[PDB]
């Protein structure tokens, strides 16, 4: 079940999308965050994304709606679709490898400014085969490793 800490973590995600902190995520706000992740959804695509979480159909996502969806996806521990989605967030050029620059770009837009050493450390730890980049197999491990 949801713990106080878990709700706080989910709130950290919610806050990233709810830019003006008015308690609801709008089409406009989602567009902004999506673009910051390297995506470029149309108005229709954004509305569809909101629709999947907007249980009462008022056109926006509130915290309870967000929590319900996030909690549901977390209980499905065997799911890999969200990991694949995260990989696509990083892999901007679609070459199947996350470069140090690609890792840094996402972290920067998530509000985490990292030094070159920090970025290289993150890559090194996940880079099992040592080729300097993180492939999908390595990514699954860095996203699920305890």
């Amino acid at each position: 079940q949801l713990t106080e800490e878990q709700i706080a973590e989910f709130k950290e995600a919610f806050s990233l999308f709810d830019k003006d902190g008015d308690g609801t995520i709008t089409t406009k706000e989602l567009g902004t965050v999506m673009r910051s992740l390297g995506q470029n959804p149309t108005e229709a695509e954004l509305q569809d994304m909101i629709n999947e979480v907007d249980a009462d159909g008022n056109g926006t996502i509130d915290f309870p709606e967000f929590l319900t969806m996030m909690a549901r996806k977390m209980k499905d521990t065997d799911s890999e679709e969200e990991i694949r989605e995260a990989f696509r967030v990083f892999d901007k050029d679609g070459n199947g490898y996350i470069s140090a620059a690609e890792l840094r770009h996402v972290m920067t837009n998530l509000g985490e400014k990292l030094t070159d050493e920090e970025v290289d450390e993150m890559i090194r730890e996940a880079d099992i085969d040592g080729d300097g980049q993180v492939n999908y197999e390595e990514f699954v491990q860095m996203m699920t490793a305890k």
Binding site: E9, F17, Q39, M70, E82, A86, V89, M107, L110
Partner: peptide, 18 residues
């Protein structure tokens, strides 16, 4: 990308840990 974002933030929390 709501959950994917959380997974990345979760990863960062882990990185900061040990």
């Amino acid at each position: 990308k709501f959950y994917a974002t959380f997974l990345i933030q979760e990863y960062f929390r882990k990185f900061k840990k040990r």
